[PDB]
Amino acid sequence: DMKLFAGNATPELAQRIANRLYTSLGDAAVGRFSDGEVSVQINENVRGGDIFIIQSTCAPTNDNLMELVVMVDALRRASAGRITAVIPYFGYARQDRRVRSARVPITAKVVADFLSSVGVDRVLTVDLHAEQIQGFFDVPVDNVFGSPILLEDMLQLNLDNPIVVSPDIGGVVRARAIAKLLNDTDMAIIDKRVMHIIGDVAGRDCVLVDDMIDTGGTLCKAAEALKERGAKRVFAYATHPIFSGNAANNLRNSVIDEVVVCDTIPLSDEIKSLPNVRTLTLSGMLAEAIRRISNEESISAMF
Amino acid sequence: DMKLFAGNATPELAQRIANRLYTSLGDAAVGRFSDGEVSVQINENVRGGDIFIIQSTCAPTNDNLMELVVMVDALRRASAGRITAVIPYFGYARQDRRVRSARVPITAKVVADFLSSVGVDRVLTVDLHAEQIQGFFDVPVDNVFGSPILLEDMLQLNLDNPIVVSPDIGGVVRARAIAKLLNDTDMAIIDKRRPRANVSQVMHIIGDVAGRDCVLVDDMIDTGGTLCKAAEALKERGAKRVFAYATHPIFSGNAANNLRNSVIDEVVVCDTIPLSDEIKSLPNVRTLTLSGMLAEAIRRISNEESISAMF
Amino acid sequence: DMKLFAGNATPELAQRIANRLYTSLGDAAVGRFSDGEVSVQINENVRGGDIFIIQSTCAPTNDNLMELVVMVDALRRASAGRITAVIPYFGYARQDRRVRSARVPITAKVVADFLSSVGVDRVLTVDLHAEQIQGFFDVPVDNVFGSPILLEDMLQLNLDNPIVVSPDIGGVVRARAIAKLLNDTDMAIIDKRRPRANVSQVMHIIGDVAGRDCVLVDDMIDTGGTLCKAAEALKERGAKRVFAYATHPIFSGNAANNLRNSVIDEVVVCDTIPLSDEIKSLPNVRTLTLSGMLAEAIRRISNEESISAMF
Amino acid sequence: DMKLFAGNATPELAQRIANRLYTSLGDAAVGRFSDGEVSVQINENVRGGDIFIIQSTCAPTNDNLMELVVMVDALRRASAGRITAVIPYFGYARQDRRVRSARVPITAKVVADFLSSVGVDRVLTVDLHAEQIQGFFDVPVDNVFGSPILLEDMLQLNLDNPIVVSPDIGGVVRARAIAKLLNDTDMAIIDKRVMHIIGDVAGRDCVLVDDMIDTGGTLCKAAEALKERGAKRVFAYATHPIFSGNAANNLRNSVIDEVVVCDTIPLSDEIKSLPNVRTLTLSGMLAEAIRRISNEESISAMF
Amino acid sequence: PDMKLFAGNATPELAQRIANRLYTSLGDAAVGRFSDGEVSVQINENVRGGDIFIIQSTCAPTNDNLMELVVMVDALRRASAGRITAVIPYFGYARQDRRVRSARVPITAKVVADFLSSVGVDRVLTVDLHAEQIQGFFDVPVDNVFGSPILLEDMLQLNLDNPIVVSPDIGGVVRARAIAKLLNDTDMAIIDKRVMHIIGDVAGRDCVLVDDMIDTGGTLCKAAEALKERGAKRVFAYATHPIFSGNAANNLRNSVIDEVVVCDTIPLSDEIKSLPNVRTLTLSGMLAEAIRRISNEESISAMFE
Amino acid sequence: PDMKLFAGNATPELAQRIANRLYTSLGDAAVGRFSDGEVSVQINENVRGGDIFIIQSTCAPTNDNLMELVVMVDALRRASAGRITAVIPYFGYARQDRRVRSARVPITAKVVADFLSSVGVDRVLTVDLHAEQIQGFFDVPVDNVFGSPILLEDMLQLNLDNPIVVSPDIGGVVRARAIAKLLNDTDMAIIDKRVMHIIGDVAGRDCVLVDDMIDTGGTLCKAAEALKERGAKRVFAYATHPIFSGNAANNLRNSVIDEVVVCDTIPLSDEIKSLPNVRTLTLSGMLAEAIRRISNEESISAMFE
Ligand SMILES: [Cl-]
Ligand SMILES: [Cl-]
Ligand SMILES: [Cl-]
Ligand SMILES: [Cl-]
């Protein structure tokens, strides 16, 4: 039967998922030795079990990654029946290619190899930076989108003739998809050369959208440029709240009226102390995905 | 010793490359048995050689792919020193994911595995449909761009205040890159919408194209339907002349007729895929060779020189 | 739950098999994109199912093979419980070695690796050109023989003191096996020689065939040239009637004309490969179904019953 | 540069090969611990070297196999540049399929996997029982034929109108190939039901040929049946002298005028004491193959 | 229910004892030799979808017994076995587990692990591996069961006089210490070559020599002599694996060892079976319980006590 | 000639010392972090066809330093490096090398070996592996160099008074015995928890505590106290790997240890660097020579003496 475990990356999210599945997070001791080496022991019988591990590979990335892979190795050596890595936010996803044959690692592929090597049978994740990461594995990878929940929220805002806009050139595809869903509305595009805005945003509510928010620098400069060109209100929507570096002060001194993110990464206390940062939960979506996977039901029929 | 072999996919491109490397193509019998099974025999000693196979996996895709993987296997079992697959056009590249967990293959990855399995040590290709395909392999994958050569030709046209245009949302990154290099001009974008069955597909133009030559640029042209509708929409919004540039001339289905009946002043493509007879009969379709780029890339690989320097 | 899917290689055989298993073929869209790339989508839930794909890798070989491996990949990524490739005719089986270290591929092994790589859990096939192909895989490979069905039909002819004949040296083991089962009759062998350019190929007959019906038996017929010359030689040595039996009707090249112009009284083949229109027009070519054998083999695999019992 | 080593299977053959290559067998201690476990130590620097190991997997098969695989593992872990297994007689070659889905191992494939696993880069062997064994490896496999040397011998016999004959049904292909080479002469075929002889052998010299001779039982019964049907002289030719079981007494009480075999397996003293058993050496052929492999010269051009 | 047991010729008696404790007949695998000495294996029963356990130590003759095991696995895998567990009470080649000073030798324990993984072993069950780290030479689960509880139970029934537990060499000190703790927290002695020097008060006491295995018996016999030279009362030698190679029979027969007590992971030769001072314990209870737990997906942790 | 050295942030000073002894500049790998803490690696020089050595212990912070190493290897492999040798003086996670009593834990040493093999390491060079058998966790060559000759040379220059070599616990007895033999065939003492009990005559003698590594220092400090309680003269503690986690600085600062002598496979914190009773030896000579030999295809066996 089904068993859930969680590491130390997203335990609050993990509990929410467990509650919606009417079950609990099983007993695994996930900690550290004195020297900082990860320590894992599975304190339950998992023989022949259908195991799900809930763990984003978010900050601290390499520790949380190592927690996940050694949990998998422990479970596999303990004769787990099936092991699914539920990785709401998949870290290193941005390292997915070698532009101009630059001598960089393709770290997303490396992580996929690592997970495959320790015996992951399946991956469940939310809004991969690049969908092609599905092809970095042999095993099934289910990449569920956060947009159904983000959209539902955008709809409850009563936007005066909203235009959707991608903060940079690499997010245009995602912005367009959101524009389609938001009553087939217009899209603008920001092109840095100074930030040139391609599209008519004067007198309109603007929905800035991306897959993730990191330092918030580009997002903040974009929101400024939008209002410098006559935008009314500016909302920032993303799935993954990375919020590294000086993100909290960037958003606090920004022009953005509200920031809406999902809960694939926990928020720091500084970010929780901001009045205009709101959280939406994917616990319902992930719980349902988990249920369907456990019960051999179609996942296709949930997008 | 460097040795070049070609299959039947791109033999004229292969020949050009060999010419530019001041060499000749090696003796390999690449054909068919009576029943359509691929027949390969390498008719020279390749032991310890630095071998490059020049084969796009273009139409007919499955025969050309099989010729490739089978050539690799024969070379490997005959103790080739190193095997580089030069695949100017990498077929199946569009099958690179499972959107909404649709029960579809990721064939681009399957092809990568197949090449890896028979012992390809390196891949050289031009303008992969998705760069992430580099990550579908363990081995080095160099993904060169045709855009420098396309650009060289764009400059030779002397355009009236040209604007670069991406025919769809996926080509935007490339369009900008070219806008920058094309005398730091500006860019426009095609936003295709068709939300309802009773409403016609509209091709929205994000940007101002009125009274300006338009350079439509993309990685490939397949049936040309999007491209022709993009062209039409540009003219209706007041664009002067419309030029279409792309690397891969796939031109399947009704492409020749679509172009013939289009408002496109000229279509300029690279030679990663040989042109059909239907396409060769069009007056306004012109071809640029990447045999220069690929010869140098190959030269650098064999001499252990930096490939980064090529971008 | 057991589920059967078919590609476009052997859809009528697939249908027969489904009928005999009292089921229907699953919903899978197996086609092409405009450019000739294989397009597959599995249009039902296969999660945890016991899946069998029915596809010979017959002509066009490379398209049919690619359909197969791509179907497997889509099923695997969609969490099929188990995937069995039912490949009645296994193409590329003749490319199974490198004679004299000739610089050729061992494509039969390459195909095996490809199937393994995409996650085939088992292979079911009929009369592999070489049984050793079983060893080209890790997974279980069941190699069933068509000869029981061919034999059933041979017995229905009532022959005048029949002698079983292997059309070449490779079919001798099978010919004997059949000689034994065909009322423990005797056997003869065709020893083809052509040592010199100025001498005609002679087809030596080892054994006495005078005043006897001859049953030419083989695993396959391709162009039929050997078979027709074998037939002619038998008659010239005094054989009465000549019947030709084989499992795989490949019939490439000029096979139809070769048979039409032959002295062969009747040619009887199994349905592992669909017949060409050219062949269907011949009065003396007849077809036997293995859909009974393959349905039972599949039934046994899914119920975990002994396959050994099937020989 | 090139280095040769040998195990304890075919050291005399190995020395002959080494002599013809104007080199020597390098220092490897190949022996046993007290309990019978194989003991290997390579007593030379092999770093970056082009290594050839000479070792048939003949009786005792599993010991000689283990000697070979652990020699390879020792050499690989010691950073050998390239490792070629020269395996004149490839044992377990007869276990190459599962007839009627019999629940037997395909041991030939298993051995190939084992050799591949320890890091063999290439295999050189003589007259594989089944040529398809080339396809059991990823790596190059060169299967040289003994027939050029066997034929050269047959030619020096002045055979009165020789007929070539395969002792059983499974050797017909090989007999025919020999018949072609022996001035395109006739072939007969033995069919056990009593042994039926298909072909006219009355008043003719008979050349019984196979890839190997094991107990000699079938070979002896065949030679008898040939003379019972009026054959003049009967010669037995094979590449691999296995000579297991009661082979020596079988041949001694047989009708065979002479037995001619190659040196891919050493002869027992009982077999050496027979007046009508002669040996031909493949040391020249194997040395030449080794030389060509070492020098990146065509092997194709030696068949 | 879907469980089936098979066995090769390495440990037939042990295999039968295990089978008896699981109330299960041994499967029909015709494991023999062709005339030339090549292994012959045929499985004469349906194993499709089964949970299959093969009982075969890789003891002398090592290479033959290893090959039986691996070809048995291959035949079973190609015959569509559901799961395959290699039960290898004594794991041969375990001592070849490293390259000391980068000596040009094989890591044959790893080579064997690779071989077993390659032919499709899904898990390994084994007793007192020479090195525990051999668990890491596999990807698959490896259960390394200890003989110590059985050996300890026997020790406790001897009614020894103030026993001292002692290692035959410096290499066995860790185990000896552990068995000393378990044996009513008694004392430990240590044997160190310097002649053999005994570190500890052995005078007047029953001594218990302990090790994972006994090979030729040479060191063990000297150890026993030295102990009695220092006034030891009785000397017992407890070990798991009775390798007994070379001159072991004479060594034990001429020793001052009161009793050698070994487990049944390697069959005894007739000669050593005759020795009055050599006694065997069976692990068939332990191994049968482990198999039953693996079969029914119960905890293996509970096997250690 | 085709040799190039790179290094991450784990052991920069050691890497530089190795580089200096090979008269070779360290290659330009920009090894850093993005804003979020993800490893950032770019190789800013041609490495095509090169013989590449990466110098990176997987010491604290372990997971960051391991990830630097593996992504460095991947970047180099995809950039067409000819050969890649991971030089990992201290190999982290080496203690997680087994599953005792089938405990549901990872064999993380093996997981790391797999990871390194997967990204394309062609060989590993390392110093005093916690378990030698970790050599068998790889398919590729693994050279496990010993610190002992450097540590022994230092010991011999102290001009000790009738030194006795001693293990801090039962687990280090084998090494202690080996170093006793090398140290002019001197005596050995053993420390056994029973309070700590010293087995041996330490009275009036300089004692040399020896181990492969020092972590918190707790056991080492008690060991030193017990030795002096039994009349030891001076107590030195020699080890290879200075892990020094937890409260190591206070433990050493408050010890009765005259000198702690460690090798430079893990950099020292500023606090421990300040301690007057803590001294480092360098292995850069040894590792540089090993690399030079690997590079020129010379015997490594000669490195052990
Ligand atoms: Cl480069
Ligand atoms: Cl069966
Ligand atoms: Cl457990
Ligand atoms: Cl060396």
Rama region for B273: left / alpha / beta (φ>0; ψ in -120 to 50; rest): beta
Please list, residue by residue across E153-175, b when 16 or more beta carbons sit within 10 angstroms of its beta carbon and e when fewer do.
Answer: ebbeeeebeebbbbbbbbebbeb
The answer to whether C143 touches C131, Cβ cutoff 8 Å, is yes
According to DSSP, the β-strands at E164-167 and E207-214 are parallel
D189 Cα distance to chain centroid: 23
**Residue B243's beta-bridge partner residues?**
B215, B266
How far apart (Å, rounded) are the C-alpha atoms in residues E142 and B239?
72
The 3-state DSSP class for residue B175 equals helix
- Residue E196's contacts (CB-CB under 8 Å, 6 or more residues apart) are E222, E223, E226
How far apart (Å, rounded) are the C-alpha atoms in residues E255 and E225?
7
Experimental method: X-ray
- Residue E69's contacts (CB-CB under 8 Å, 6 or more residues apart) are E8, E10, E54, E56, E58, E86, E88, E116
How far apart (Å, rounded) are the C-alpha atoms in residues E234 and E224?
9
Q: Quote the Cα angle for C239-C244-C248, to 5°.
A: 160
**Residue F113's beta-bridge partner residues?**
none
Please list, residue by residue across D118-138, b when 16 or more beta carbons sit within 10 angstroms of its beta carbon and e when fewer do.
Answer: bbbbbbbbbbbbbbbbbbbbb
Query: Which pair of tokens denotes residue F109?
Result: 């040493």
Q: Do chain E and B touch: 3 or more Cβ pairs under 8 angstroms?
A: no
F51 Cα distance to chain centroid: 24
Reply yes or no on domain D1-145+281-303 having CATH 3.40.50.150: no
Q: Quote the Cα angle for D31-D37-D40, to 5°.
A: 40
Query: Which pair of tokens denotes residue D22?
Result: 């104007």
CA-nearest residue to E181 within chain F is: F194
The answer to whether E164 touches E189, Cβ cutoff 8 Å, is yes
Neighbour tally for F157: CB within 10 Å: 8
* Min Cα separation D106/chain B (Å): 22
User: Which ligand has its closest atom nearest to the C-alpha of E79?
Assistant: 2
* Min Cα separation C202/chain B (Å): 23
Query: Which pair of tokens denotes residue C144?
Result: 């069933």
Q: What is the sign of the dihedral through the CA atoms of B280, B283, B288 and B291?
A: positive
The answer to whether C297 touches E40, Cβ cutoff 8 Å, is no
Reported CATH class of domain F1-146+282-305: alpha beta
Q: Which of B184, B265, B253, B177 is nearest to B218 (CA)?
A: B177
How far apart (Å, rounded) are the C-alpha atoms in residues C94 and C108?
7
- For residue D172, the surrounding DSSP H or E stretch is helix D172-181
Same fold, E1-146+282-305 and E147-281: yes
Neighbour tally for C135: CB within 10 Å: 27
How far apart (Å, rounded) are the C-alpha atoms in residues D74 and D72?
5
**Residue D210's beta-bridge partner residues?**
D238
Neighbour tally for E77: CB within 10 Å: 20
C192 Cα distance to chain centroid: 23
The answer to whether D267 touches D243, Cβ cutoff 8 Å, is yes
How far apart (Å, rounded) are the C-alpha atoms in residues B237 and E147?
87
- How far apart, in Å, are the Cα atoms of F67 and each of A92, A281, F9, F82, F85? 11, 31, 11, 21, 16
Query: Which pair of tokens denotes residue A203?
Result: 């007198």
Query: Can the peptide bond before residue C60 be classed as cis, meaning omega within 30 degrees of 0?
Result: yes
The answer to whether F74 touches F119, Cβ cutoff 8 Å, is yes
How far apart (Å, rounded) are the C-alpha atoms in residues B262 and B250?
17
- SS3 letters for chain C? CEEEEECCCCHHHHHHHHHHCCCCCCCEEEEECCCCCEEEEECCCCECCEEEEECCCCCCHHHHHHHHHHHHHHHHHCCECEEEEEECCCCCCCCCCCHHHCCCCCHHHHHHHHHHHHCCCEEEEECCCCHHHHHHCCCCEEEECCHHHHHHHHHCCCCCCCEEEECCHHHHHHHHHHHHHCCCCCEEEEEEECCCCCCCCEEEEECCCCCCCEEEEEEEECCCHHHHHHHHHHHHCCCCCEEEEEEEECCCCCHHHHHHCCCCCEEEEECCCCCCHHHHCCCCEEEECCHHHHHHHHHHHHCCCCCHHHC
Query: Which pair of tokens denotes residue F152?
Result: 């022994």
Mutate: best of C84, C90, C101, partner D, most D CBs <10 A: C101
The answer to whether B90 touches B57, Cβ cutoff 8 Å, is yes
Q: Quote the Cα angle for D237-D241-D245, to 5°.
A: 120
Measure the CA dihedral E183/E185/E186/E188, to 10°: 100
Tokens 């479970």, residue located? A75
How far apart (Å, rounded) are the C-alpha atoms in residues C156 and A254?
91
According to DSSP, the β-strands at C50-54 and C2-6 are parallel
CA-nearest residue to D75 within chain F is: F141
* Min Cα separation B67/chain C (Å): 10
How far apart (Å, rounded) are the C-alpha atoms in residues C243 and C286?
11
* Min Cα separation C302/chain E (Å): 10
Q: Which of A47, A73, F171, F100 is nearest to E128 (CA)?
A: F100
The answer to whether C95 touches C130, Cβ cutoff 8 Å, is no
Query: Which pair of tokens denotes residue C239?
Result: 């054989």
Q: Does C228 reach chain B within 8 Å, measured CB to CB?
A: no
* Catalytic-labelled residue, pool E4, E110, E193, E222: E193
Measure the CA dihedral B180/B175/B143/B150, to 10°: -80
How far apart (Å, rounded) are the C-alpha atoms in residues E80 and C41?
29
The answer to whether E272 touches E279, Cβ cutoff 8 Å, is no
How far apart (Å, rounded) are the C-alpha atoms in residues A98 and A154?
36
- DSSP per residue, A230-256: T-S-EEEEEEEE---TTHHHHHHTS--
Is A210 annotated in a binding site? The answer is yes
Is C236 annotated in a binding site? The answer is no
- Residue D62's contacts (CB-CB under 8 Å, 6 or more residues apart) are E37, E39, E63, E64, E66, E67
Q: Does C41 reach chain A within 8 Å, measured CB to CB?
A: no
First to last CA, chain F: 28
- Residue C149's contacts (CB-CB under 8 Å, 6 or more residues apart) are C270, C288, C289, C290, C292, C293
Neighbour tally for E9: CB within 10 Å: 16
Cα diameter, chain D: 62
**Domain ranges within chain D, ordered by starting residue:** 1-145+281-303, 146-280
Q: Quote the Cα angle for F108-F112-F116, to 5°.
A: 170
CA-nearest residue to D141 within chain B is: B77
The 3-state DSSP class for residue B167 equals coil
* Facing residue for F78 by CB, picked from B140, B304, B305: B140
CB-based burial of residue D69 (10 Å sphere; 0-12 exposed, 13-18 middle, 19+ buried)? buried
Neighbour tally for F30: CB within 10 Å: 11
- Residue E164's contacts (CB-CB under 8 Å, 6 or more residues apart) are E180, E186, E187, E188, E189, E200, E201, E202, E205, E206, E207, E208
Q: Does D79 reach chain F within 8 Å, measured CB to CB?
A: yes
For the domain spanning D146-280, the CATH number is: 3.40.50.2020
Q: Which of C75, C155, C150, C162 is nearest to C119 (CA)?
A: C75
The answer to whether E147 touches E128, Cβ cutoff 8 Å, is yes
According to DSSP, the β-strands at A163-166 and A141-144 are unpaired
**Residues in chain A closer than 8 A to B110 (CB atoms):** none
Breaks (C-N over 2.5 A) in chain A follow: 193
CB-based burial of residue C195 (10 Å sphere; 0-12 exposed, 13-18 middle, 19+ buried)? exposed
**Residues in chain C closer than 8 A to A116 (CB atoms):** none
Q: Does B253 reach chain C within 8 Å, measured CB to CB?
A: yes
How far apart (Å, rounded) are the C-alpha atoms in residues F125 and B118?
31
- Residue E76's contacts (CB-CB under 8 Å, 6 or more residues apart) are D103, E6, E43, E47, E52, E54, E84
Helices (H), chain F: 12-21, 62-78, 108-119, 148-157, 173-182, 218-229, 248-253, 270-274, 284-296
How far apart (Å, rounded) are the C-alpha atoms in residues A298 and F230?
73
* Selected residues 92-151 of chain F with any CB under 8 Å from a CB in chain A: 92-93, 95-96, 99, 102-108, 110-111, 114-115, 118-119
How far apart (Å, rounded) are the C-alpha atoms in residues F5 and F221?
39
How far apart (Å, rounded) are the C-alpha atoms in residues B11 and B291?
12
Q: Quick one: DSSP state of residue F267?
A: P
Q: Please give the CATH architecture assigned to the domain spanning F147-281.
A: 3-Layer(aba) Sandwich (3.40)
Neighbour tally for B296: CB within 10 Å: 18
Helices C291-302 and C11-20 sit at what angle, rounded to 10 degrees?
Answer: 60
Helices (H), E120-206: 148-157, 173-182
C84 CA distance to ligand 2 centroid (A)?
A: 15
**Residues in chain F closer than 8 A to D82 (CB atoms):** none
How far apart (Å, rounded) are the C-alpha atoms in residues A170 and A191?
10
User: In this complex, do E48 and C304 lie within 8 Å of one another by their Cβ atoms?
Assistant: yes
How far apart (Å, rounded) are the C-alpha atoms in residues B99 and E23?
53
Phi then psi dihedrals of residue A139, to 5 deg: -75, 160
* Facing residue for F46 by CB, picked from B122, B140, B306: B306
Q: Quick one: DSSP state of residue D167?
A: S
User: Which ligand has its closest atom nearest to the C-alpha of F47?
Assistant: 1
Q: Which of D145, D112, D83, D173 is nearest to C101 (CA)?
A: D145
- How far apart, in Å, are the Cα atoms of F21 and each of A38, B213, D282, F143? 35, 63, 52, 20
Q: Do chain A and E touch: 3 or more Cβ pairs under 8 angstroms?
A: yes
Phi then psi dihedrals of residue A129, to 5 deg: -50, -40
How far apart (Å, rounded) are the C-alpha atoms in residues E280 and E264?
6
Q: Quote the Cα angle for F267-F270-F271, to 5°.
A: 120
**Residues in chain D closer than 8 A to F142 (CB atoms):** 77
The answer to whether B83 touches B73, Cβ cutoff 8 Å, is no
How far apart (Å, rounded) are the C-alpha atoms in residues D69 and E111?
8
Helices B11-20 and B291-302 sit at what angle, rounded to 10 degrees?
Answer: 60
User: Which ligand has its closest atom nearest to the C-alpha of E45?
Assistant: 2
- How far apart, in Å, are the Cα atoms of B50 and each of B137, B203, B303? 20, 49, 10
**Residues in chain B closer than 8 A to C65 (CB atoms):** 62, 66
Q: Does E2 reach chain A within 8 Å, measured CB to CB?
A: no
User: In this complex, do E300 and F200 lie within 8 Å of one another by their Cβ atoms?
Assistant: no
Q: Quote the Cα angle for B78-B83-B85, to 5°.
A: 130
How far apart (Å, rounded) are the C-alpha atoms in residues E118 and E112?
10
Neighbour tally for B297: CB within 10 Å: 23
Query: Which pair of tokens denotes residue B249?
Result: 């001339």
- How far apart, in Å, are the Cα atoms of A21 and each of A15, A56, C42? 10, 19, 29
Q: Which CATH number fits domain C146-288: 3.90.79.10, 3.40.50.2020, 3.40.190.10, 3.40.50.10860?
A: 3.40.50.2020
How far apart (Å, rounded) are the C-alpha atoms in residues F238 and F166?
10
Q: Which of A256, A277, A94, A63 is nearest to A171 (CA)?
A: A94
Neighbour tally for E127: CB within 10 Å: 26
B195 Cα distance to chain centroid: 31
Query: Which pair of tokens denotes residue F29?
Result: 């790998």
User: In this complex, do A79 and E141 lie within 8 Å of one another by their Cβ atoms?
Assistant: yes
Fold classified for B1-145+289-311: Rossmann fold (3.40.50)
The 3-state DSSP class for residue B3 equals strand
Neighbour tally for E91: CB within 10 Å: 28
E-state strands within B172-276? 187-193, 202-206, 214-221, 242-249, 266-270
C87 CA distance to ligand 2 centroid (A)?
A: 18
* Facing residue for F141 by CB, picked from D45, D48, D77: D77
* Min Cα separation F174/chain B (Å): 43
Q: Is there a catalytic annotation at residue E193?
A: yes
B140 CA distance to ligand 1 centroid (A)?
A: 10
How far apart (Å, rounded) are the C-alpha atoms in residues B176 and B164?
8
